[PDB]
Amino acid sequence: KIIIRQITDNDLELLMAWRSNPLIYKFFYIQKEPLKWEEHYSWWMSRENRVDWIILLRENNTIRKVGSVNVSQLNTDNPEIGILIGEFFLWGKHIGRHSVSLVLKWLKNIGYKKAHARILENNIRSIKLFESLGFKKTKKGRENEWIYEVNL
Amino acid sequence: ANCKKSKIIIRQITDNDLELLMAWRSNPLIYKFFYIQKEPLKWEEHYSWWMSRENRVDWIILLRENNTIRKVGSVNVSQLNTDNPEIGILIGEFFLWGKHIGRHSVSLVLKWLKNIGYKKAHARILENNIRSIKLFESLGFKKTKKGRENEWIYEVNL
């Protein structure tokens, strides 16, 4: 079973360690190095019009932090959805999909009509994930980046 | 145990730290330095390690900066049932490397070992791990003996 809960201060280091793994930041726009704390903290301080959750996976009477899911641009009619699962061997097990659908349901219920994701051309798993939820490539983003959109 | 330099503190690990610890060890930039690891860890392997622990202590390394503390690595001693326990160290944040955090953390562990009556300690280090070699030699460790392939034991008298 999957549950998502809001991020706290305490999760900052775990979030950074996921984002500092090259196996993962190969999929983030222009990131070439692991994160520095001041950049990570500065991101944390400058958060506006967004919600960030930690993904919790329950199995065998254990509950663990497995990734993060977020929406930003909530001051628009088309908020942006981000999804990161930190455990590399959980990929392909629909944890990302289920987590995004939790945020999509929330978005729909609070009145948003659309939502989108920015994805790099090489990020095939993310593409499959969003397309399994009905998103479609509608627009080019920055270089080698594409915007996928859904109707809620 | 704590170590002003900003300040380094070490505190015992907890169930809650497990995912962060796995996240550091699953980074290829780190596991480059680990005997034969070629892949990120799986939770089942990581958690089976955790439920298997004996004759060891693991700490999280805390860095206090602007008077606010954060988790930056892990330091550990194992083989405590012998007269020559093994010390392991890992700094998870990458742009902290080369700032003596690992050195100070290890020396905190050496002081704790000494005070309860150990007289020796060692580290197992891969040949390619130049920062770790410098760390332990800065504390007086001496290359002593081959470990497994491309791996060396470095020992110190406490």
Swiss-Prot record, chain A:
Residues 2-152 form the N-acetyltransferase domain. This is Uncharacterized protein MJ1062. It comes from Methanocaldococcus jannaschii (strain ATCC 43067 / DSM 2661 / JAL-1 / JCM 10045 / NBRC 100440). The chain holds residues 333 to 484 of 484 of the full protein.
